[PDB]
Symmetry: C3
Subunit: 230 residues, 3 copies
């Protein structure tokens, strides 16, 4: 309770934990192989986030980085979360549209570059260089957003309407929520330091629960996750 | 030789190295694609363990963690081993039964959570919180054990008898040996400290060689690893 | 500019960045799923290397390792690069020949052992033991080279001539360039220290740009990356 942001770390831990349990129960019983892949992906995402929220809450996932002459509290565990959960979210989208394997590779690899350069920026001790990593990471994010909108152009032919509809909704959820993360980091504790860590943590908690549990609720309620069967 | 547990680290290095060489030789010549996947998986497992045993033996894979007011010797290299070798062992089981891809994802991701939360527990400086990570990791292990027993329920129909027989044996080997690891950690150097590090290292060496080389000997001697062919 | 090797780190950053941009543009428009996988793999390789070259240039990817009684500058970011880019290069080769999945596993796992034991050697504080890790890593490299020459022996039957021709060329490029890396490390800053870090960095920059951008130019100009189509 000693860090003011504890309350949002606690709330994020609880909501990710409850979302995980909900999705775990919800997928109990499903047999359809296509649906099993979406439940597995979609349940792992908040499970991983639960563990990394808890590590921040307990202090394990926090480190001090000197930059600006100051000792700056940097929650590194966010990058260990996102390293796994953001490619998993992209895989859910990619599987929905039956993406080609080359496209999945491009997406997962650009996402790794996005998170790994964000982690390098988050831990860089020369203040000005932190924003160079932010820019490179943002370029990788823009590439991902580009592929999500313009990289499935051969798939439209042979896409079930309900898959098309659930994919468009989740793609729009993804583009809006993910695009807010570079802005929060830029103005927050890792970047310019104009928004305090307390509020930054709240913002990422709202984004994360929305991008993982809210995304997952929309996907897992959809018929698009089942193969078409008589 | 300065740490009493060196002898078990040396013995573990040698047995993993010899098991690797044996499996490498044994799979020389196999053409069958199914069998090649099992030899590859099963040979990589003790090869990786050989390197991490050697890193503990040479001291690289040891760190001191303050907790309990004391400086506690924690062999972190075990988690770098298990991060790769325990999903590989699960993949051998999963391939045997032709598991659905969603099930393999669930298994590999729960296993990553199990090892990563065990690593966080192993390095946590607040003593009481180490057991919170142990509990979460144990929950993930129990999920894996649950899936190995109740998650292949559609596969029984179309399973060759020899695959069914080798899978049941290896599944039983896996459930018994893996379940001992949380107990050893709980009573050993990472947990309550009731069993000294010397004996703990012996216990994990016996478990590891059994779970990797003993498992691999049972699998690789089986006809279940070959596709059925005239 | 304070470290004499900065100029090769700068040149390597620029050439990897320009190679990435070139391959990104070059693959704009390709529809063929086979070709998309090769463009994705082959574009990610210099993109990742660009980020790790930049991290060395900016100092983030450098650490000091005590060994020999001295504080030795070790660029660890090379291992974070190679951890991802060397399996990706192997995947390009493997996909060219339609390798069996067991063979791809063997290659990617031996490559992980090669890079992870090279990283352990690079950070080991007992000088003599650094060469033990070098030897193990070299054994893994020799295994990979062995598989590239003798592990596709069932694939020769059903291999298009242009795939066979591009694969032989890239395989020869790979064996020659990769084999130089253990020699550079052995005589350079990480090993015996007979070649200064400045020259070592130049050597790895020439190898890396050749093994990634030069390799990629040969592959991506080939018809072998397209499925055979009327
Ligand atoms: C967390 C617990 C419920 C585990 C402990 C219980 C044990 C066994 C009993 C539960 C068991 C009956 C599970 C029932 C579900 C069935 C199949 C489950 O999963 C379905 C899919 C693919 O269809 O993958 C879904 C993928 C999933 C991945 C599993 C990860 C989990 C691991 C534990 C830590 C997490 C965090 C949640 C904490 C909260 C509090
Ligand atoms: C959860 C999500 C929806 C997040 C989406 C991303 C997003 C763009 C981030 C917005 C964060 C913001 C609301 C938080 C405000 C912090 C702030 C009030 C700090 C207060 O305390 C200190 C002061 C000076 O006294 O600094 C003052 C700080 C300021 C400079 C605050 C700047 C915020 C903006 C000017 C709002 C931009 C408009 C957007 C909605 C873009 C569309
Ligand atoms: C360790 C050495 C034998 C390597 C050095 C030798 C070189 C080349 C000569 C050996 C060569 C003829 C290998 C013969 C086997 C053939 C094909 C091998 O592998 C078969 C399968 C799939 O069928 O994958 C199997 C997957 C396997 C993965 C390879 C990992 C190894 C890498 C080296 C370090 C290890 C640790 C063992 C140390 C002991 C001492
Ligand atoms: C290789 C594997 C098969 C491992 C399987 C997992 C397993 C449950 C772990 C057992 C470990 C155990 C045999 C090691 C004993 C350590 C011990 C003798 C320490 C000696 O020295 C100090 C003392 C006090 O003087 O502490 C005293 C320490 C004690 C409290 C020891 C506690 C051990 C048990 C009471 C045995 C439980 C029974 C099981 C076989 C479960 C079935
Ligand atoms: C680097 C920039 C061009 C990104 C910013 C731009 C944004 C959107 C505009 C560009 C956009 C029109 C891309 C056009 C290409 C199309 C499809 C691209 O990719 C094709 C394949 C599979 O066929 O994967 C190919 C796999 C590839 C992986 C993408 C990784 C990149 C990420 C950014 C950092 C890098 C480093 C390069 C820096 C230099 C300077
Ligand atoms: C980019 C690539 C092609 C690299 C391929 C791998 C390769 C084998 C590495 C060669 C590196 C080499 C040319 C660099 C030379 C460093 C060197 C001149 C150092 C100079 O300064 C200090 C001195 C003493 O005054 O040490 C003296 C240092 C010496 C001992 C230098 C040793 C180099 C050799 C004797 C050359 C071997 C022949 C090969 C071409 C193998 C075929
Ligand atoms: C899915 C859910 C039930 C998760 C609920 C949210 C939760 C994890 C975080 C909320 C913290 C909350 C209790 C706030 C008040 C603090 C308080 C207790 C007293 C203050 O008092 C103080 C004074 O400084 C702090 O106490 C010590 C530390 C604790 C407060 C933190 C404990 C860790 C957690 C509560 C989480 C435990 C994880 C488990 C789910 C493990 C089981 C795994 C498995 C079976 C799948
Ligand atoms: C597959 C096998 C042959 C492995 C055999 C077991 C072994 C790796 C560990 C046993 C240690 C043992 C010799 C005990 C006595 C110590 C002693 C030498 C003297 C004591 O004297 C002392 C005094 O404190 C310590 O010596 C210095 C360190 C060494 C003892 C340790 C050296 C490392 C290893 C012996 C392993 C080397 C790895 C290789 C396989 C590399 C090749 C890779 C490739 C070709 C695939
Ligand atoms: C693809 C290319 C355009 C890459 C070009 C090469 C380059 C990255 C490295 C060359 C350094 C060079 C300018 C040498 C002179 C130094 C100098 C400026 C003055 C010396 O003056 C000094 C005194 O000590 C140092 O300056 C401070 C640091 C900088 C010199 C380094 C800045 C980082 C880089 C220049 C790279 C930026 C990365 C971007 C591509 C981000 C955008 C991502 C996205 C849109 C895809
Ligand atoms: C968020 C992101 C930036 C992260 C992206 C990925 C990331 C984790 C990068 C990792 C690269 C690298 C380790 C960097 C080190 C930095 C540093 C300063 C020191 C680190 O930290 C230290 C300091 O004490 C220890 O590291 C050395 C040991 C290793 C970390 C573990 C060794 C592993 C092996 C030798 C075993 C072989 C593994 C394989 C077989 C894997 C293949 C799987 C297969 C079987 C299919
Ligand atoms: C046992 C477990 C807990 C481990 C589970 C996974 C694990 C390794 C978690 C890693 C997350 C994270 C790095 C945590 C950092 C903690 C910390 C305090 C600081 C670390 O350690 C430090 C301290 O000096 C350095 O880290 C920063 C640099 C990075 C480690 C490496 C950067 C990688 C990239 C920028 C390149 C892009 C990579 C991708 C392209 C990968 C995608 C593959 C593709 C091409 C298909
Ligand atoms: C170049 C090579 C040697 C590297 C090869 C791989 C490598 C990165 C090895 C990593 C092992 C290990 C982390 C070693 C730690 C060393 C040390 C001294 C301390 C480190 O560094 C520290 C010091 O502060 C922090 O580490 C602990 C936290 C973790 C690093 C991150 C935890 C991750 C999780 C708990 C979440 C679960 C992840 C999974 C779900 C992944 C599965 C994917 C799925 C969903 C499909
Ligand atoms: C589950 C959490 C999700 C969906 C997180 C998304 C994170 C991002 C899109 C992060 C992007 C970043 C940048 C583009 C620039 C650097 C800072 C980051 C890593 C916050
Ligand atoms: C090759 C080595 C094998 C099979 C290792 C298995 C390791 C485990 C099943 C570890 C489990 C753990 C817990 C469930 C709780 C926390 C402590 C661990 C990581 C030892
Ligand atoms: C893109 C960069 C490439 C192709 C790098 C290749 C790196 C190697 C083949 C590294 C090999 C090493 C050894 C065999 C011994 C230990 C030192 C290393 C890691 C340099």
């Amino acid at each position: 309770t000693g860090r003011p942001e504890w309350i949002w770390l606690a709330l994020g831990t609880a909501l990710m934990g409850l979302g995980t349990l909900y999705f775990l129960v919800k997928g109990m019983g499903v047999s359809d192989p296509d649906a099993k892949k979406f439940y597995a992906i979609t349940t792992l995402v908040p499970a991983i986030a639960f563990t990394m929220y808890l590590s921040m809450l307990l202090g394990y996932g926090l480190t001090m980085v000197p930059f600006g002459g100051e000792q700056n509290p940097i929650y590194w565990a966010r990058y260990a979360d996102w390293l796994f959960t953001t490619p998993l979210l992209l895989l859910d989208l990619a599987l929905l549209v039956d993406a080609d394997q080359g496209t999945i590779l491009a997406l997962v690899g650009a996402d790794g570059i996005m998170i790994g350069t964000g982690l390098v920026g988050a831990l860089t001790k020369v203040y000005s260089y932190r924003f160079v990593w932010w820019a490179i990471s943002t370029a990788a994010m823009l590439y991902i957003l580009y592929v999500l909108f313009f990289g499935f152009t051969s798939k439209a032919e042979s896409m079930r309407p309900e898959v098309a509809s659930t994919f468009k909704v989740l793609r729009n959820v993804t583009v809006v929520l993910w695009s807010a993360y570079p802005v929060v980091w830029l103005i927050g504790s890792e970047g310019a330091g104009i928004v305090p860590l307390n509020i930054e943590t709240l913002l990422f908690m709202v984004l994360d629960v929305s991008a993982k549990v809210g995304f997952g609720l929309i996907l897992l309620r959809s018929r698009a996750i089942f193969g078409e069967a008589e």
